[PDB]
């Protein structure tokens, strides 16, 4: 968990602080997987050029643009679709490189969520800085790792993983105890996989 | 994984089930930020169970050929043939994993990505396609090592590293280096959580 800070207090930090803006785009999903698993929500993340999962967005130079303007410019290159606004602002966090990470989020219709994925494959950043969008599975299968735990066992931008788990909580998309349960299962999954290659003694 | 030939795979007997997966890749002459050659782009997919793997799935050899079955299960919205067959491996519950591979042009690879986002499997069994970055940045983790530190279907990760070698897409010593750096990354990060 990262240290949180209000927007107005974040925008008065000295010139030694850089700002980032990322967007969590998600849609309520009424479907079920394999006839019994409710999907609840579909959330968009993406594979970055450095091989890590993160959110759409990136560095925003506050000197030249509003946070919203700068985020939408980035989204224009990496998604090429919509225009977020201050109403979509969710949180600001301090990262450990003095960076203030601003998190935006908007619930989309399922139709627009799919339209974003379609526009992403045609975007300027596709195949360069963005290597592909992925939906987050929020369910957990009977084996207690399938789905969200396995997904959390992937390799993330540290800030993005914190943001994802934070947003799911405060947006009442997943109970906090279920988020931490899945994170614990992910960590035990990572240990199970690592032991096969490089076990401790 | 213990490898076996195609003809010997089909004589494994009815007790063995067969899976078929496709590694679609393209030569990539681009350079990331104008410095680092991308070499090749390979398509993988995020699965319903949160793991990265290859398109494809199980095939019922009593009703489809391996190639016909594969083509129905790709979940990409190209038709693979016998010549695209690459290797067969025996999974670590009697499953023979057949791996098919075909080199495409980058533009054709892009066309598969565009068709994939419109497939009926999208948003249920397939949660998205990703391109494998085969470059390694100067920090020794950026790109391919970080990518290999994600979570894979165990067969898919072995199929990827095997295919990259035998197809002469990456020298073996570079594949070992990238895997080693990814595994060391996983260890150090895991030590922050479960020392």
């Amino acid at each position: 968990e990262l240290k949180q800070i209000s927007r107005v207090e974040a925008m008065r930090l000295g010139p030694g602080w850089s700002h980032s803006c990322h967007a969590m785009l998600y849609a309520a999903n009424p479907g079920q997987l394999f006839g019994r698993i409710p999907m609840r929500f579909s959330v968009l993340m993406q594979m970055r050029f450095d091989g890590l999962l993160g959110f759409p967005g990136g560095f925003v130079d506050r000197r030249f643009w509003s946070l919203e303007d700068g985020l939408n410019r980035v989204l224009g290159l990496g998604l090429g679709c919509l225009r977020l606004t201050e109403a979509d602002y969710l949180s600001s966090h301090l990262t450990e490189h003095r960076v203030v990470a601003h998190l935006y989020a908007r619930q989309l219709t399922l139709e627009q969520l799919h339209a974003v994925e379609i526009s992403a494959v045609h975007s300027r950043d596709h195949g360069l800085e963005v290597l592909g969008l992925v939906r987050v599975p929020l369910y957990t299968q009977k084996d207690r790792v399938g789905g969200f735990p396995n997904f959390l066992s992937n390799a993330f931008v540290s800030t993005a993983k914190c943001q994802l788990l934070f947003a799911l909580k405060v947006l009442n998309m997943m109970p906090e105890e279920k988020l931490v349960e899945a994170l614990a299962a992910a960590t035990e999954k990572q240990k199970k996989a690592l032991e096969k290659l490089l076990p401790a003694s």
Side-chain angles (χ1 to χ4, degrees), chain A residues 2 4-95 97-123 125-201:
Chain A
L2 297 170
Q4 200 173 356
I5 183 170
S6 71
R7 166 161 188 163
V8 66
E9 287 175 302
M11 301 311 293
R12 65 184 307 262
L13 292 165
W17 288 84
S18 61
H19 301 255
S20 74
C21 298
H22 292 90
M24 180 173 112
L25 305 173
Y26 66 104
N29 193 321
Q32 62 183 353
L33 182 72
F34 306 150
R36 62 157 81 251
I37 298 173
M39 291 182 292
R40 301 195 67 185
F41 294 101
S42 297
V43 179
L44 288 180
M45 297 194 74
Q46 66 191 25
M47 178 61 68
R48 303 159 39 77
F49 65 90
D50 59 1
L52 301 175
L53 298 179
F55 283 116
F59 163 69
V60 170
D61 196 325
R62 64 162 300 188
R63 304 173 294 173
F64 293 79
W65 299 284
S66 69
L67 295 182
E68 288 71 28
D69 285 350
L71 172 60
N72 287 331
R73 287 181 82 270
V74 171
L75 295 183
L77 301 177
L79 301 177
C81 215
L82 55 76
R83 152 173 187 279
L84 302 185
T85 72
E86 185 284 319
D88 303 304
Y89 168 90
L90 195 65
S91 67
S92 304
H93 287 87
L94 306 176
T95 309
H97 336 298
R98 296 181 182 80
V99 178
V100 189
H102 306 287
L103 182 59
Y104 292 73
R106 184 189 293 178
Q107 185 180 350
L108 313 176
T109 57
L110 279 171
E111 179 172 338
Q112 186 171 30
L113 196 78
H114 190 213
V116 170
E117 298 167 320
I118 292 165
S119 65
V121 300
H122 292 100
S123 66
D125 284 354
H126 175 75
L128 302 177
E129 296 87 3
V130 180
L131 293 182
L133 275 59
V134 305
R135 295 189 178 191
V136 181
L138 284 189
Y139 47 83
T140 299
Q141 289 182 268
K142 206 179 180 182
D143 64 7
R144 307 317 313 257
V145 295
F148 195 38
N150 277 342
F151 179 85
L152 291 173
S153 77
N154 286 289
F156 295 79
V157 175
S158 294
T159 299
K161 197 187 199 178
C162 293
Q163 282 173 324
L164 173 63
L165 299 168
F166 174 85
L168 291 172
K169 176 183 77 173
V170 304
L171 298 173
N172 294 326
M173 297 166 70
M174 277 189 52
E176 175 64 0
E177 69 157 316
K178 306 302 295 182
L179 292 166
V180 184
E181 174 175 12
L183 180 60
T187 304
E188 186 62 23
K189 188 69 183 291
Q190 293 177 324
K191 181 171 184 288
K192 186 178 182 176
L194 187 59
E195 282 178 345
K196 295 184 175 63
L197 299 164
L198 201 67
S201 180

